From a paper:
The protein, termed Pa Dps, adopts the Dps subunit fold and oligomerizes into a nearly spherical 12-mer quaternary structure at pH 6.0 or in the presence of divalent cations at neutral pH and above. The 12-Mer Pa Dps contains two di-iron centers at the interface of each subunit dimer, coordinated by conserved His, Glu, and Asp residues. In vitro, the di-iron centers catalyze the oxidation of Fe2+ utilizing H2O2 (not O2) as an oxidant, suggesting Pa Dps functions to aid P. aeruginosa to survive H2O2-mediated oxidative stress. The Pa Dps structure harbors a novel network of Tyr residues at the interface of each subunit dimer between the two di-iron centers, which captures radicals generated during Fe2+ oxidation at the ferroxidase centers and forms di-tyrosine linkages, thus effectively trapping the radicals within the Dps shell.
The screening of crystallization conditions produced two crystal forms, prismatic crystals of a primitive orthorhombic form (Dps-o) and primitive cubic lattice crystals (Dps-c). The Dps-c structure is nearly identical to the Dps-o structure, as indicated by the 0.38 Å RMSD deviation observed on superposing the Cα atoms in the dodecamers (1832 residues). Superposition of the Dps-c and Dps-c-Fe structures or Dps-o- and Dps-o-Fe shows that only small rearrangements of D64 and E68 side chains are required to bind the iron ions in the ferroxidase centers of Pa Dps.
Numbering used by the authors:
A (entry chain C), B (entry chain A), C (entry chain E), D (entry chain D), E (entry chain L), F (entry chain B), ...: 1 to 155
C-alpha cells in the first residue's frame, strides 16, 4: 500500500536518515550508560549505580520511540553494532574510567544527542513534518535535563 | 465572563470550525474501527479483533481531547450523527468487508485524519495558537504510527 | 462452520433485529450523553460534567456487550451513522440546552432504552434465549438506577 | 444441621445430578482446552496458544462455581477421572490434531456444554431454583461468545 | 419528573414493600454478623473472626444494592432501628452465644433472607420486574453459598 | 486466661461502659448518614450522595475500632438495635427531610459524638488508659473536621 | 563543566529570566488556589473544594517542571516569597471572597499565566529553544482548559 | 525445525516419559486437592478449605510448568483422563473422607510426587538436562514444604 | 450554623492564631526545602535532591492538615506571601548556599517548627483541645525524625 | 551539629534508656513470635501459623519505629544479642511448647511490653516529650489488641 | 577489599571469561530480537511484533543478571560494540528478512546461547560455583522454552 | 505421621544441623545490618541507610526460607539469642563503627554466610537433597552479589 501522509518520498527518506543518526547516538548512549551502571565503583557507587539505571531505562524506551518514527515514515530502522558504529557521533569507551570521568562522558553524550537533534531541524523547516519535530523536541528536553543533573554532581 | 487567552473571537471561531472537522473525522474513524472490531472474521480474527480494540480505545480518548480544545476556545463541540456526517471527510462502510479490505480502509482513515489536521495549520501560522498546534501534531503522530502498523499487515 | 446453540437461524435473526434496535438506542444515548458532558455550563457544571462522564463511560462498554451478543447469535453488528439513525427511537439534540433540559432528556433516554429492551422479551418468551434475556435485564437495571440519580436532581 | 433453603431433598438431589454433568462436561472441556493450549502448532501458534489460555483460565473458575453450587444444594461435588468420564458427554482427544481441527473440536465442546445446560432447565421450570438458573445462563453466555470467536477463525 | 419504567405506582410500591423487608432482614443479619465478629471466642476465634468479617463486609455492600433498587422504583429506602425492627424476621441475639450457637444462628439468618426473597417472587410473576428478580437471585445465591460454608463447620 | 494490662476489672468495665455509649452514638450516626445517602434529593443530589458516602464509609471503620477497644478491655461489644437504642444519645430521623435539614442533622450528630467522647475523659484522668484516650481524640478530630465541611454548605 | 546545548550564555539567561516570571506567576496561582481550596464556603463547597484541589495538585507539579527547565538552562530557580512577589503579575487576595469571586479570580489567574507564557515566545523567535517553547505550550494548554471549566460555572 | 539443544532424540523422549509421569501425578494431585477443597467438612472447614485452595492454585501453575518443559523437549504433553490414569501413581479417591483422612492422603500425595521426581534423577545423572533437573528440584521443594504443613495438622 | 464543639469562640480564635503561625512556619519550610531541592549541587546532588524531595512532599501534606484544623476551629486559614511573611519565625534564604549550609538551615528549620508547636501547648492546657494537641505532637515527631536524618549527614 | 529539640542531653539519655528497654522487649517478643510461627504444630497449625505471622510482621515495623525515636533523641539504638538479653524483661523459650503454651507465652509477652511502656511515663511527665508519649501509647494499643485476640483462643 | 567467596582468582577469571561470551551472545540476540520487532512485516506483524517484544524485554533483564554475576566474581563487564562483536558467536543480520526467516534466525539464536552456556559447565564442575551454575541453568531453560514457541510457528 | 521423602532420619538431622548453622549466621547478619541501618552516620547517611534497608529486608525473608527448609526436613528451627550465639560464626559488633568499617564488616558477613553454605555441600552430595542444595545456591548468589556492591564503595 502507498503512503500518503503529506510528505514526499525523497523528503521522508532524508528525514529517516537524520533519525537514523539520532537512533544511533541514542543507542550508543544507552549502551554506554548501561556499561557505567554495571562497572562504576568508589564512594558514589550506590548513587551512580541508581542514577545510571534510571537513565538507561529511559533510553531503552527512547530508542523504541525513534525506531517507530522511522518505520512510520516508511523506512527500516537500523539495528546492528555495525550500523550504529557507522552512524554514531558518540566516542565509545572500552575501559573502566573513574566515576568522575564516567559522569563527564555521560554529560557529553547527552549534549552529543542534542547536537544530532538540532542538525535535523533545518531539513524540517522546508518540509512540514510536525511529528518528527516534536520527537526531537522531547529528546532534547530529556537530555538537557539529564545533563543538568549529571553535571551538578561535579560543581 | 469574557475570554482573554490571546486570540480574538473571529479567529477562535475559525480554529473551532477546523477542529470541528477534525473531531468529525476522528469520531467517524472511531465508529468504523469499532465496527470492524466487532465484525472482522477469518484466520486473522484474533489479531485484528485485538488490534482494532487498541485503536478504537485510543480514539475514544482523542475525541474528548479534540472536543475539550473546542470548548477551551469558546465554542460548542458538535456531537450528533447529523453533524459528524455533514462535517466528515471519511467514507462510511455500511457492509462487512473482507479482513484485508477492513485493514485498507483503516489505513486511509488514518491518512484522512492527517490530511484534515494538515489543512488547519495555515490558520495557526497567521495567528498564534500553540496549544491547538500541539494537538494536531499529537494526532498526526498517533495516526502516522497506526498507519505503519496497519499496512505492515498488507506487505 | 454451522451454528448449533439450540436456536434456529431465523429465530436468531429475529433476536438480532431487536438487539440492533437496543444497540442503536444505546449508542445514540452514548453520544448524546457524551455531547452533554462536553457542552453543559452553569453552576452545576462540575457535578454534571462528572456525572455525564460516568454515564457515557458505562455506555461505551454496554455498546460492546450488546454488539458481541449480536455476533454470538451469528449476525453482523450495525455500526454507522446511517444505521443507527434508521434504527434509533431516541431523537437527537442538535443544539445546546440548559442544564436542566439536558438532565430531562437523559432521564427520557434511560426510559427509552428500557422500553426497547422490554419490546424484546415477547420474542424471548417464544424462543428460549436466556443469555440475551440476562443482557436485557442488566441494561434495564443500569438505566433504571441512572434515571433515579438523574431525576433526583430535579426534585 | 438441616437445610431449609426452600428446595426439598429430592429436588436438590436432582439439580445436583444435572450440575454434576455440567461440571463433568465443563471440566472435560477445561482439560481438552488446556491440552490444546500446550500442544497446538503451526503459524497460528501465537494466536491460539493465547486464545486457548484465556479459555482454560476462565474454565478453571467455572468448575469452582459449578462445584460450589452443588455444595450449596447439599451434595458432594464429583472430582475424579472416573466420575468425569462417566458423567461427561464430551469425548476427549487422545492424540494431537491439526490447528483447524483443534478449533472445530473446541466450538463443538462449547456447544456440548450449552446442550448440557439446557438439559437442566426443565428440572428448574418445575421447581424454583433461581440461583442455579442464573449459573446456567452465565455458562451459556460464556460458551456462546467463545463459539463465535472460535468459529470466526474458520470463515 | 414522572417515573416511566413500565411498572407504575401501586406495583412499584408493592415491590418496594417487599424489598424493604429484604433490606431489614439483610441489615439485621449484617449487624448480627458484625456483632459475632467482635464477640466470638474459643479455639475457633481466628477462623470465625475472619469468616464473619468476610460476611459482614459483603452484607454492607448488599444493603446498598437493595436500598438503591428501592430508590430506582421510586420509594424511600428505610433506615432506622425501628423500621428495621418492624420489618425484619430475624430474631435478635442480645447476649453472647457460644461459637457453635453463633454459627447455627448465622445459618438460620441466611435461610431467613432466602425465605424473604422467595416470598417476593410471586408478586414479580405478575409485574415483569426483571431487575428486582435478578437482585433477589443474586442475594439467594450468596446466602445459599454462605449457608453451606457455615453449616459445614457443625458436622 | 486472666487479663493483666494495668487496669482493674471494674475500672475496665467503666471505660467499656463509656465506649459502649460512644459505639452506639457512632453506629446511630453511621446508619443515619447511610440513610441520607440513599434518600437525599434535590439539585445537590450528586454532591451530597457522594459526601454522605465518604462519611458512612469512614464511620463503618470507626465502629470496628471502637468495638475492638471494648474487646481489648475484656468486655463484649454491644451490637443490636435494642442495645444501640438504649445506649445512644442521638435521635433517628424516621422520615425523609429536605437536604438542608439532612445537612443540619449530620452537623448536630458530629457534635453529639464529640460530646459523648468528651464525657469519658474524666474517667480516664482517674484511671490511666492512654490508648482509649487516643481513640477518643481521633474520633473528636474526625467529627470536628466533618462538621466543618458539612456546615460550610449552609454558609 | 561548560554547558554546550546549542544556546549561548546570554540567550540562556534571557530565557531563564522569562521562565522565572512564569514560575512566579505559576507559584502565586498555586498558593491562591490552595488558599481558596481551604477557605471556600456555601452550597458549592463540595464541588469547588474538590475542583480547586485538582488544580493546586497539578500546579504543584507544574512549578517543578518550570523550575527544572531553568536549572537545565544553567541558572538558579527563584524560590522565596520576596522573589515571587517581585516577579509575579498576579494580584494576591488577602481576604476570603465569595465563592463566585474566587472562581472569577482563578479564571483571571489562568489568563495571567497564559499572558506571561506568550510574552516569552518572541525571544524564542530569535534563538531556537524548542524544549522551552513546548513547556510554554503545555502550560497554555492546561490553563486554557482550566479557564473553560471555571468560566462554565459562571454562565 | 531440527531441535538442537544438546540432548539426543531418544534421551529427550525418555526425559519426556519421566516428566509425563510427573505431570500425571501433579494433575492427579491437583484434582484430588481441588476435590477435597470442595468437599471437606467439620470444625476445620475454613482452615482446610483455604489451605487446599492455596495448594490447588499452586498445582494448577505447576502442571503448566511441567507440560511446557515436555514441549521444550519436543514431545506432546499428555492431557486426558486416560493418559493420566495410566501414568499416575496416585491412589484416586472416589468418596468423601473425614478431614483427618483427607489431610493424610494429601500428605501421601506430596511424597508420591517426590518419589516420582526422584525416580527421574538416575536418568538425569547420565544425561545433561539441567533445566529439567531444576524443575524437579523446585517441585520437590514445594511438595516437601507442603508435606510439613499438612502433617503438622496431625501432630 | 452555630459551632458547638465544646470550645468558645475566643478560645478557638486563640488556638487558630497559634496554628496560623505553625502553618506559616511549615509553609516557609516547605518552600525553602523545595527551593533547595531545585538548586543544590555538588557530589551530594543525587542524595540531597532526593532527600529534600521527600521532605517537601511531606510538608505539602502537613500544610493541608494544619490548614484544615484551623477551618475545623471556625476560622480562615492564611494563604498569601504577606500573611506567611508576617506570621513566620523562619527566615528565608534568598541566594544559593553550599550543600552543607542548606543541610544546616533545614536542621534549624525543623527545630524552629518544634518550638512553634511547643509554644501552643500552654493554651491547650487551659483550653481542652485534644485534636489540636495530637496534631502538634505529630508535627514534632516528624520534624524531630527529619532533624536526625539531616544532621546525621554532617557528623 | 547541636541538638535543640527542647530536651536536655541527660534527659534525652534517660528517655533513650527507657526506649532501649522497650526495644529489647519488642525485639525479644518479635523473635519469640517468629520462632513459634515456624515451630507450632497440631490441629491449629494453619490458624496459629498465620496469626503469628501477622504478629511478627507488625513487630518488625515496631522495632524500626522504636529504634528511630531513640535516634531522633540523639543516642545509639541497641542491636545485638547481648544488648537485648541484658535489656529485656521477657524470657525466651529454648524448646518447642505445646500450642496452648505458645499462646499463653505470647499473651504474657504482650502484657510484658505494655508494662515496660507504662514504666516510661513517669519520666515523660517530668520532662516533656510528647512524640515519645504517643509512641508508647500506640505500642500499648497494639499489644492490648493482640492480647485480646490471643487470649480469646484459650476461652 | 580482598574477595573471599571460596573461588580463587584464577578460577574466577576463567568463569568471568565464559560469562562474558554468554553476555555478548545474550546481548547480540537482544538487539537482534529488538531489531526484528521494529522491522517485521506481513500478515504476522501483530503476533510477531508482540512476541518479539516479549522476548527482547526478557533479554534486557538477562543481560543485567549476567553482567552482575561477572561483577560478583570481581571482573569488569564488557559493554561496547567492539567487545560484543569480538566475543559474540551470534551472527549479525544487516538487512530485513522475511518473517519466516526472522523466526528461523531467532531459533538459531536461542540454540547458540544454550551452546555457550553448556560450554561453561566444565569449569563449574572442576570448581564449585553453584550460583553461576544456576544462572546458566535458568538461561538454558528460558531459551529452550523460547525455541519451542518460535519453531512451533513453522511446523 | 511418618516422613517419607527419600532421605533417612539420621541424614536429615545432619542436614538440619548444617542449616541451623546457616540460619544462625543469616539471622546474625540480619540483626547486624539492621543495627547499622539505624546507627550509621556521616555524608553517606542517606545511601547507606537505604542500602542497609534493602539488605536487612531481604535477609528477613531469607531466615524464613531457611527455617522452613529445616521444618520440612522434620526438625525444629532454632530461634533464640542463645541458640544463634552458639551456632553463629559472625563476630557481633557492640559499638557504633564508622561507616567504612560498617561496610567492611558487612562484606565479611556476606563472605561468612557463603563459607557456612559451602561447608554444607560435602554432606548432601553424599545424600541427594537437591531442594536444600538449591537453597544454599540462592543464598550464595545473594550474598555474593551484595558483597560486590558493598566492596565497590571502598574502592
Amino acid at each position: 500500500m502507498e503512503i500518503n501522509i503529506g510528505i514526499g518520498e525523497q523528503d521522508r527518506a532524508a528525514i529517516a536518515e537524520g533519525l537514523s543518526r539520532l537512533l544511533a547516538d541514542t543507542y550508543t548512549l544507552y549502551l554506554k550508560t548501561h556499561n557505567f551502571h554495571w562497572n562504576v565503583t568508589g564512594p558514589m557507587f550506590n548513587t551512580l549505580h541508581l542514577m545510571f539505571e534510571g537513565q538507561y531505562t529511559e533510553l531503552a524506551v527512547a530508542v523504541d520511540d525513534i525506531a517507530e518514527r522511522i518505520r512510520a515514515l516508511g523506512f527500516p530502522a537500523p539495528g546492528t553494532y555495525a550500523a550504529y558504529a557507522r552512524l554514531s557521533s558518540i566516542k565509545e569507551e572500552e575501559g573502566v574510567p573513574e566515576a568522575e570521568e564516567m559522569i563527564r562522558q555521560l554529560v557529553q553524550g547527552q549534549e552529543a544527542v542534542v547536537r544530532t537533534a538540532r542538525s535535523i531541524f533545518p531539513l524540517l523547516d522546508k518540509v512540514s513534518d510536525e511529528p518528527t519535530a516534536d520527537l526531537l523536541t522531547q529528546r532534547m528536553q530529556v537530555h538537557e535535563k539529564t545533563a543538568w543533573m549529571l553535571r551538578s554532581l561535579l560543581a
